[PDB]
């Protein structure tokens, strides 16, 4: 019975941690996506400027 | 070794064991169940 109690409690605590783990993983995913999108935009802008300046 | 029968030794004990089993299963299930709920929480 002691083992059963432990198993159930661990299963629940583990579920909470995983749920906590998943939330952090999704926050990281969102941050990475945001950073990547910024790079695209900024990168291209810089490119044109440098390219625009060279053309000029 | 042999059993000794008399209705004086145990009638006092039956009322006590009944009161304790009833009010003990009440407060014991309430406490134990509450603890289980907290673990589930």
Swiss-Prot record, chain A:
Superkingdom field: Eukaryota
Subcellular location: Plastid, Chloroplast thylakoid membrane
Note from the entry: In plastids the F-type ATPase is also known as CF(1)CF(0).
Described purpose of this protein according to its UniProt entry: F(1)F(0) ATP synthase produces ATP from ADP in the presence of a proton or sodium gradient. F-type ATPases consist of two structural domains, F(1) containing the extramembraneous catalytic core and F(0) containing the membrane proton channel, linked together by a central stalk and a peripheral stalk. During catalysis, ATP synthesis in the catalytic domain of F(1) is coupled via a rotary mechanism of the central stalk subunits to proton translocation.
Annotated family: Belongs to the ATPase B chain family.
Record note on quaternary structure: F-type ATPases have 2 components, F(1) - the catalytic core - and F(0) - the membrane proton channel. F(1) has five subunits: alpha(3), beta(3), gamma(1), delta(1), epsilon(1). F(0) has four main subunits: a(1), b(1), b'(1) and c(10-14). The alpha and beta chains form an alternating ring which encloses part of the gamma chain. F(1) is attached to F(0) by a central stalk formed by the gamma and epsilon chains, while a peripheral stalk is formed by the delta, b and b' chains.
UniProt-recorded name of the protein: ATP synthase subunit b', chloroplastic
Swiss-Prot record, chain B:
Listed GO MF terms: ATP binding; proton-transporting ATP synthase activity, rotational mechanism
Name under which the protein is recorded: ATP synthase subunit b, chloroplastic
Disulfide bonds: none
GO cellular component, one term: proton-transporting ATP synthase complex
Keyword Disulfide bond: no
Miscellaneous section: In plastids the F-type ATPase is also known as CF(1)CF(0).
Function statement: F(1)F(0) ATP synthase produces ATP from ADP in the presence of a proton or sodium gradient. F-type ATPases consist of two structural domains, F(1) containing the extramembraneous catalytic core and F(0) containing the membrane proton channel, linked together by a central stalk and a peripheral stalk. During catalysis, ATP synthesis in the catalytic domain of F(1) is coupled via a rotary mechanism of the central stalk subunits to proton translocation. Component of the F(0) channel, it forms part of the peripheral stalk, linking F(1) to F(0).
Superkingdom in the source lineage: Eukaryota
Organism encoding this protein: Spinacia oleracea (Spinach)
Subcellular location field: Plastid, Chloroplast thylakoid membrane
Signal peptide annotation: none
Keyword Membrane found: yes
Oligomeric and partner information: F-type ATPases have 2 components, F(1) - the catalytic core - and F(0) - the membrane proton channel. F(1) has five subunits: alpha(3), beta(3), gamma(1), delta(1), epsilon(1). F(0) has four main subunits: a(1), b(1), b'(1) and c(10-14). The alpha and beta chains form an alternating ring which encloses part of the gamma chain. F(1) is attached to F(0) by a central stalk formed by the gamma and epsilon chains, while a peripheral stalk is formed by the delta, b and b' chains.
Gene designation per UniProt: atpF
Family: Belongs to the ATPase B chain family.
UniProtKB keywords: ATP synthesis, ATP-binding, CF(0), Chloroplast, Hydrogen ion transport, Ion transport, Membrane, Nucleotide-binding, Plastid, Thylakoid, Transmembrane, Transmembrane helix, Transport
Residues that span the membrane, as ranges: 6-28
